[PDB]
Amino acid sequence: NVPVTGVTVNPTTAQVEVGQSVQLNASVAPSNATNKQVTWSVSGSSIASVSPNGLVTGLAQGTTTVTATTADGNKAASATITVAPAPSTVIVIGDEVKGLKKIGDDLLFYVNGATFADLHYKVNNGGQLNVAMAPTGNGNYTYPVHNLKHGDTVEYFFTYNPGQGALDTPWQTYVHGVTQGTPE
Amino acid sequence: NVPVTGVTVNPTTAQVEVGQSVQLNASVAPSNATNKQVTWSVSGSSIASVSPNGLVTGLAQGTTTVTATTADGNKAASATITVAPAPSTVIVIGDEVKGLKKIGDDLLFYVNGATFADLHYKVNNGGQLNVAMAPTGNGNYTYPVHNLKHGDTVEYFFTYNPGQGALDTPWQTYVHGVTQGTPE
Amino acid sequence: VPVTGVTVNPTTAQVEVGQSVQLNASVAPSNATNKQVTWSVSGSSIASVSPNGLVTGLAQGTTTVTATTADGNKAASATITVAPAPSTVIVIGDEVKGLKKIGDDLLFYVNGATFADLHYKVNNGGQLNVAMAPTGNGNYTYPVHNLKHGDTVEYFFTYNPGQGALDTPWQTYVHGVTQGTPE
Amino acid sequence: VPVTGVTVNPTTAQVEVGQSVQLNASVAPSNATNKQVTWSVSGSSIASVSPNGLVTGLAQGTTTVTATTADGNKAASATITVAPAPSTVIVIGDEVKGLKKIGDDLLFYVNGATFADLHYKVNNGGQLNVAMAPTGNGNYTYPVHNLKHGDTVEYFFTYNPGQGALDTPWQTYVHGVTQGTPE
Ligand SMILES: [Cl-]
Ligand SMILES: [Cl-]
Ligand SMILES: [Cl-]
Ligand SMILES: [Cl-]
Ligand SMILES: [Cl-]
Ligand SMILES: [Cl-]
Numbered sequence: 001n002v003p004v005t006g007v008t009v010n011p012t013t014a015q016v017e018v019g020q021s022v023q024l025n026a027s028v029a030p031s032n033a034t035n036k037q038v039t040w041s042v043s044g045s046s047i048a049s050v051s052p053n054g055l056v057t058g059l060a061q062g063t064t065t066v067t068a069t070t071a072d073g074n075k076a077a078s079a080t081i082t083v084a085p086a087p088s089t090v091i092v093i094g095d096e097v098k099g100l101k102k103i104g105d106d107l108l109f110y111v112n113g114a115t116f117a118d119l120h121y122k123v124n125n126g127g128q129l130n131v132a133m134a135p136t137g138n139g140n141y142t143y144p145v146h147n148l149k150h151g152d153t154v155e156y157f158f159t160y161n162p163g164q165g166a167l168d169t170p171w172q173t174y175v176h177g178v179t180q181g182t183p184e
Numbered sequence: 185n186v187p188v189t190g191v192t193v194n195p196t197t198a199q200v201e202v203g204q205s206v207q208l209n210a211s212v213a214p215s216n217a218t219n220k221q222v223t224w225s226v227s228g229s230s231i232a233s234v235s236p237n238g239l240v241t242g243l244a245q246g247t248t249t250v251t252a253t254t255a256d257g258n259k260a261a262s263a264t265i266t267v268a269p270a271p272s273t274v275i276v277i278g279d280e281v282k283g284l285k286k287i288g289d290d291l292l293f294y295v296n297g298a299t300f301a302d303l304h305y306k307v308n309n310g311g312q313l314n315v316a317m318a319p320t321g322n323g324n325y326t327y328p329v330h331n332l333k334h335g336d337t338v339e340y341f342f343t344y345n346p347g348q349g350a351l352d353t354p355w356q357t358y359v360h361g362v363t364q365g366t367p368e
Numbered sequence: 369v370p371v372t373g374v375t376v377n378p379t380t381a382q383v384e385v386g387q388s389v390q391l392n393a394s395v396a397p398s399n400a401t402n403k404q405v406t407w408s409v410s411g412s413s414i415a416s417v418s419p420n421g422l423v424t425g426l427a428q429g430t431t432t433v434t435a436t437t438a439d440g441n442k443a444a445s446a447t448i449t450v451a452p453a454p455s456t457v458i459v460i461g462d463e464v465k466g467l468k469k470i471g472d473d474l475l476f477y478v479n480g481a482t483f484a485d486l487h488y489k490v491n492n493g494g495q496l497n498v499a500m501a502p503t504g505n506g507n508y509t510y511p512v513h514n515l516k517h518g519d520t521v522e523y524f525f526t527y528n529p530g531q532g533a534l535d536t537p538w539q540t541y542v543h544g545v546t547q548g549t550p551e
Numbered sequence: 552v553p554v555t556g557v558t559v560n561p562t563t564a565q566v567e568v569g570q571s572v573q574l575n576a577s578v579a580p581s582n583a584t585n586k587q588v589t590w591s592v593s594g595s596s597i598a599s600v601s602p603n604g605l606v607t608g609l610a611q612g613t614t615t616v617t618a619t620t621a622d623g624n625k626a627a628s629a630t631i632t633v634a635p636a637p638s639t640v641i642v643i644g645d646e647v648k649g650l651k652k653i654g655d656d657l658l659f660y661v662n663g664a665t666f667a668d669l670h671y672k673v674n675n676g677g678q679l680n681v682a683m684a685p686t687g688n689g690n691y692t693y694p695v696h697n698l699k700h701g702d703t704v705e706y707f708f709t710y711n712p713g714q715g716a717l718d719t720p721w722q723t724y725v726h727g728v729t730q731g732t733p734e
Contacts, residue, residue, distance in 0.1 A: 008687060015638060019310060039316070043684060044412045044696060046330040046429065051314040052302060060331075061635065062413070063656040063694045065684050074441035077687030080694075082653050085611070085635035088565065103632050106613040118236060124308050125359045126203060126335025130235040132223070134593060134615045137558045137627030144594065144613045144630075146230040147244075151310025153337075175309045192504060199455060227501060228513060228595045230612065245452065246596070247473040247511045249501050258624035261504030264511075266470050269428070269452035272382065287449050290430040318410060318432045321375045321444030328411065328430045328447075386676070406682070413696040418680040419668060426696075485602060491674045492725045493569070493701025497601040499589070513596040513609075516699075518676025542675045 002034040004073040009054075009066065013080045016048070016058035017087075018105075019150035019177045024054035024079055026068035037071035048081045058083040060149075091181030098158050098169060102181055107145040107174070109133065109156065117141040117160035124153050133158075152176040186218040188257040193238075193250065197264045200232070200242035201271075202289075203334035203361045208238035208263055210252035221255035232265045242267040244333075275365030282342050282353060286365055291329040291358070293317065293340065301325040301344035308337050317342075336360040371440040372396035374405065376421075376433070382449040383415075383425035386517035386544045391421035391446055393435035402439030409433045415448050425450035427516075453544070460548035465525055465536060469548070474512040474521065474541065476500065481527035484508035488523035490515070500525075519543040554623040555579035557588065559604075559616070565632040566598075566608035569700035569727045574604035574629055576618035585622030592616045598631050608633035610699075636727070643731035648708055648719060652731070657695040657704065657724065659683065664710035667691035671706035673698070683708075702726040 006029040014022045026038040040050040044064035049057045056066055060083060067078040091102040094110070098117075101108040110133075111117035117133040123145075133141035145154070154174040159166060173179075190213040198206045210222040224234040228248035233241045240250055244267060251262040275286040278294070282301075285292040294317075295301035301317040307329075317325035329338070338358040343350060357363075373396035381389040393405040407417040411431030416424045423433055428450055436443045458469040461477070468475040477500075478484035484500040490512075500508035512521065521541040527534060540546075556579035564572040576588040590600040594614030599607045606616055611633055619626045641652040644660070651658040660683075661667035667683040673695075683691035695704065704724040710717060723729075 006687070012686075021311075041408075041410070043409060044694065045328070045410045045431075046413045047696070049313045049315060052316045053314075055314075057311070057313055061654060062696050063651075063653045063658050064412070065692060065694065067684065069441075074436075075687070076685055078684055078692070080658060080692060082638050082656075084638040085654065088632065088634040090632075103613045104611060104635065106611075106632075108613050108630060122335075123333075124335035124337050125362065126333075127205075127241070129233045129241055130237075130239075131233060132236045134617065134628050135626055136562070137556065137625070142615060142628065142630055144229070144615065146594065146597070146612050149307075149310075151306075151308035153308050178309065190504070196503075225591075225593070227592060228511065229593045229614075230596045231513070245471060246513050247468075247470045247475050248595070249509060249511065251501065253624075258619075259504070260502055262501055262509070264475060264509060266455050266473075268455040269471065272449065272451040274449075287430045288428060288452065290428075290449075292430050292447060318434065318445050319443055320379070321373065321442070326432060326445065326447055328432065330411065330414070330429050412694065416679045416681060419682040422680075424677065424679055489701075490699075491701040492703050492728060493699075494607065496599045496607055497605075498599060499602040511595065516673075516676075518672075518674040520675050545675060 002030065002032050004033045004035060004070045004075055005029040007038060007068050007070050007075045007077045009068050009077045009079040011079060014056070015082045015084050016056070017084050018058045018060065021055055021057040022081070024056055024066060026054060028070060033072065035072035038068040041067045041069065047083050056081050061085055090184060092184045093174065093179055093181045100174060105148050105176070107148060107154065109143045109145065111141040111158055111160045113139050113162050114141060114160035117158055119143045119156055119158055121145065121154060121156035123148070148176040150177045186214065186216050188217045188219060188254045188259055189213040191222060191252050191254050191259045191261045193252050193261045193263040195263060198240070199266045199268050200240070201268050202242045202244065205239055205241040206265070208240055208250060210238060212254060217256065219256035222252040225251045225253065231267050240265050245269055274368060276368045277358065277363055277365045284358060289332050289360070291332060291338065293327045293329065295325040295342055295344045297323050297346050298325060298344035301342055303327045303340055303342055305329065305338060305340035307332070332360040334361045369401045371400040371402060371437045371442060374435055374437050374442050375444040376435050376446045378446055380447045382451055383423070384451050385425045385427060385453060388422055388424045389448070391417070391423055391433055391435070393421065393444070395437055400439065402437070404438040405435040406438070407433060407435055414450050423448050428452045456550050458548045458550050460541065460546060467541060472515050474515065476510040476512065476523070478508040478525055478527045480506050481508060481529050484525055484527040486510050486523060486525060488512065488521055491520050515543040517544040552584045554583040554585060554620045554625060557618055557620050557625050558627040559618050559629045561629055563630045565634055566606070567634050568608045568610060568636060571605055571607045572631070574600070574606055574616055574618070576604065576627070578620055583622065585620070587621040588618040589621070590616060590618055597633050606631050611635045639733050641731045641733050643724065643729060650724060655698050657698065659693040659695065659706070661691040661708055661710045663689050664691060664712050667708055667710040669693050669706060669708060671695065671704055674703050698726040700727040
């Protein structure tokens with residue numbers, strides 16, 4: 001018997017990174033309205049997901065609009081959600097002789113001090129890819145894997161010849177945006 | 185003592201789908217050249233990967249150039265590789281009451297005959313996303329998940345109320361471009 | 369007086385990027401006082417919907433355009449699939465020079481030369497200078513990647529077909545507008 | 552007479568999309584007869600390299616630009632990182648109407664109106680008509696998604712600030728060129 005007069009969404013704006021999420025609050029007026037149910041909706045669902053409780057999750061770079069609409073009265077308020085780039089910062093996961101630099105959503109694989117170096121890698125349940133790593137020109141090597149998303153699972157190991165003869169590396173698993181690096 | 189005179193790559197062009205691969209042949213002249221080693225390289229490695237044996241794998245929509253260069257003489261030939269879109273065709277994986285349509289690289293989740301329907305899903309090792317599915321307006325529901333790639337692993341189940349009361353579905357696993365559907 | 373329900377017409381439709389489909393909302397009784405609806409879209413990157421329910425395809429994917437009633441806020445949906453540009457081949461030039469349009473990439477080409485460069489600009493971006501890749505039979509190619517509908521490519525070649533080097537005249541390609549022959 | 556080796560200068564460099572960095576190849580002995588190199592790139596979608604080693608950033612990612620010697624075909628590499636456009640906010644308009652540039656999306660806005668539509672065209676694409684989304688305090692927003700450097704946006708609004716409806720004049724935004732104030 002106490003009708004909804006209005007709604008507002010707080011925060012009214014928010015920046016998340018990909019895989020990051022932010023809880024939104026629908027504020028229904030008056031305080032003692034009989035029906036305080038709202039429907040959450042988003043106009044760019046490839047940018048950000050919203051749950052039935054207004055938890056918003058960053059899916060991909062962009063700005064979108066999340067709307068709370070009241071069950072009683074169909075009053076609507078909206079917030080602007082900016083999903084930001086993965087920082088351009090370099091994070092080393094590996095050692096002097098071989099591993100990864102995570103550089104945003106590309107992975108730069110490296111082998112220092114070899115006569116050659118191949119990378120063997122797979123992403124999620126896609127197949128093995130074998131690549132010869134590019135020579136820097138000083139006995140060092142690199143190969144970029146491009147455009148991973150949050151939760152991409154990377155299994156890789158190297159083949160290379162540091163002197164004595166060609167050596168295989170132990171496989172490693174990298175999950176994009178969960179494997180901790182060293183922020184160098 | 186028999187020097188390389190030239191090289192050609194066959195096929196000279198090729199279309200693959202994403203996750204599809206094509207073996208390329210470097211033809212070194214003359215036939216009895218002492219050194220027949222070549223280096224394979226690709227100018228758009230976000231489009232297609234090439235192995236040290238000239239196996240080319242479709243990574244993402246585009247056209248790129250794969251080059252064989254001879255170890256002896258640095259003679260170069262190149263092929264054009266077109267990585268094609270995942271067909272726009274609709275493939276149903278699920279039943280009368282609930283599952284997926286695979287429509288290119290988007291997944292259309294569905295629940296037929298409910299008073300409401302939520303989807304619970306996760307991709308690779310990213311987190312759970314909870315979404316209320318959109319009403320069609322006849323007791324039916326849909327929710328598109330966007331832009332999966334080859335080997336994306338999707339675990340999902342539904343919550344919905346077909347009458348008696350709200351019911352949870354058994355979890356299912358979908359691997360993008362490996363789970364077989366029904367081409368409808 | 370009240371409205372009771374609504375569904376949308378069509379319920380599912382497939383478009384190419386850059387193409388449109390007119391949506392129409394049918395609201396239960398004709399003797400419903402208020403007919404007017406609001407159009408919205410779940411996935412605005414994929415498809416845009418006008419205030420009168422015209423859906424245009426912007427990018428590959430499937431999205432949900434919903435009509436909600438002014439009187440009632442009853443809601444119904446169409447599933448819109450935006451299909452990618454065919455990887456058919458479209459030749460725009462002559463035996464010596466031009467593009468192949470292969471979906472959203474352009475394969476620029478020069479046939480019969482000792483080198484070939486490309487000079488191109490996309491819309492109001494900067495000019496880029498590139499050496500075209502040798503094929504190994506006196507011909508050259510260079511892919512420009514991932515053009516979107518309405519992209520405007522200005523370009524000319526520098527090549528030497530033997531009796532000395534040449535700059536061709538600038539041509540204008542508009543992506544999804546300019547046409548050629550496929551074969 | 553021969554060349555013995557080469558490395559590239561710089562070895563690693565980071566650019567924004569649309570920005571450039573001059574690469575230089577240093578080939579072992581100065582008393583190497585032939586100095587000339589060929590520039591190539593592993594990832595042409597990410598970065599373009601000119602015949603004289605100028606690398607321009609086209610799109611987010613890391614790629615390898617290699618200099619190989621004409622005499623010797625010795626090869627060396629730089630790792631190029633192309634950084635995304637900051638998600639800083641850039642206001643281009645007044646208290647009533649304009650855009651926020653937020654990385655590669657534009658948030659169009661009208662403040663203080665009873666409705667607001669956007670009319671926009673991108674480069675030589677078609678005009679799109681959209682109803683701007685109510686905020687719930689008499690203001691309106693509408694994101695345009697994923698513009699690339701050099702994209703040319705023509706737009707005007709239809710809104711009613713109370714004493715009746717208005718079409719504003721068309722403005723031209725060029726992505727990464729047009730500027731405003733961030734704050
Ligand atoms: Cl979207
Ligand atoms: Cl949006
Ligand atoms: Cl690439
Ligand atoms: Cl390429
Ligand atoms: Cl959607
Ligand atoms: Cl690369």
